[PDB]
């Protein structure tokens, strides 16, 4: 294993950007020695990589150029790399360079014929890796060099989807300009509009609407409007409710879900907005006195204080000043609108329980937590 130490030294020189040291090590070695030294998969820091892969992941463009131009390195050799916390299996030098944002390395590899549409184990492409970071320059360079924009990953997630969820408005608009399908559905049925609605990316929502993205009901029984309402995205709900192709019951359901979600969200608590949206929805139920849109309220449950959801504007006005009643009403409405689907509806329940516990209402906290654990089956 004497050559194994030289292979380790080659890997070190490549990883630390010592292109002169690497050139000295590789010079005049036999072809078999060159192949062994440059194909040795070194394991280090949870990563498994060849000198080319580690040089591309660290952005050592001189080392990459040397290995490509003067030593005929396999441009498709794969390895395992770690980005922050997550690990990626079956990643090429080009995928690593795209994910790390090394534009010069991406150019050097693409110009030497690197497979631009290589897929990792999760079927991730260099284009998807660059879309995650939001590097519009790298996305453009890849797309121009025949990078297939329509290749999805393990869960049928698209580059448009990942860009819309991360808030990269420029990348989203560019992808839509390059004829990317805005109505592509994930494995569950969710769309890029679904992803952008939950994250509150208002500009990306506007852009997807301008490109005539269809409103669809995913496998969880949710529209983009319904997802925005559950996530307390008041601006996204206001924007989507201005779209005329939504029915009256959908508008009322969105308003009620938004108001109810405003009452038990850890990071978006707003009791005023809770009552505002709930009362608006109730008022819109009672417009035409002849044809009232009556709500089919669920039977009471013990964990919510045995309370029943308000059926009429007067009943809703009764609890306007009762903060606990409004919290319980929020939980009740969220269970009514979302309980019929496969949705983990338990986080606001756990939050309400914890809030009760910090105020020494251990019995009500335990009731809430018991009901939350019960709802998970």
């Amino acid at each position: 294993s004497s050559m194994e130490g030289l292979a380790g030294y080659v890997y070190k020189a490549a990883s630390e950007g010592k292109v002169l040291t690497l050139a000295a090590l590789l010079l005049n070695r036999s072809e078999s020695d060159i192949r062994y030294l440059l194909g040795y998969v070194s394991q280090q820091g949870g990563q498994r990589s060849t000198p080319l892969i580690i040089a591309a992941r660290n952005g050592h463009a001189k080392v990459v150029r040397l290995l490509l131009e003067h030593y005929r390195v396999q441009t498709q050799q794969t390895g395992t790399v770690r980005f922050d916390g997550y690990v990626i299996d079956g990643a090429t030098a080009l995928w690593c360079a795209a994910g790390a944002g090394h534009f010069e390395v991406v150019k050097l590899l693409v110009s030497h014929g690197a497979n631009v549409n290589h897929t990792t184990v999760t079927n991730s492409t260099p284009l998807r890796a660059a879309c995650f970071d939001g590097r519009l320059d790298i996305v453009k360079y890849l797309v121009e060099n025949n990078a297939n924009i329509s290749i999805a990953n393990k869960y049928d997630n698209t580059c448009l989807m990942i860009a819309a969820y991360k808030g990269h408005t420029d990348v989203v608009r560019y992808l839509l300009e390059q004829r990317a399908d805005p109505n592509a559905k994930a494995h569950c049925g969710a769309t890029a509009l679904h992803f952008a609605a939950e994250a509150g990316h208002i500009d990306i929502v506007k852009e997807l609407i301008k490109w005539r993205a269809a409103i669809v009901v995913n496998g969880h029984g949710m529209t983009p409007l319904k997802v925005a309402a559950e996530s307390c995205k008041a601006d996204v709900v206001e924007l989507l409710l201005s779209h005329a192709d939504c029915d009256r019951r959908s508008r009322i359901e969105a308003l009620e879900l938004l108001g109810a979600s405003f009452a038990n969200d850890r990071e978006n608590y707003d009791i005023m907005k809770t009552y505002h949206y709930l009362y608006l929805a109730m008022l819109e139920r009672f417009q035409d006195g002849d044809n009232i849109l009556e709500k089919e309220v669920l039977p009471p449950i013990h964990a919510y204080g045995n309370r029943t959801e308000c059926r009429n504007p007067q009943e809703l006005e009764a609890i306007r000043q009762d903060r606990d009643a409004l919290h319980m009403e929020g939980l009740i409405v969220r269970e009514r609108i979302l309980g019929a689907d496969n949705i983990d509806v338990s986080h606001p329940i756990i939050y309400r329980g914890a809030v009760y516990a910090d105020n020494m209402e251990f019995e009500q906290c335990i009731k809430l937590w018991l009901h939350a654990l019960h709802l998970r089956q």
């Binding site: 997550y86 995650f132 990953n153 990942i162 969710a190 679904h194 939950e198 996530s231 949705i343």
Partner: peptide
């Protein structure tokens, strides 16, 4: 945190 391979919050993937 959620799995980066699918951005749907309503799915249940093993991270």
């Amino acid at each position: 945190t959620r799995t980066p391979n699918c951005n749907c919050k309503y799915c249940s993937h093993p991270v």
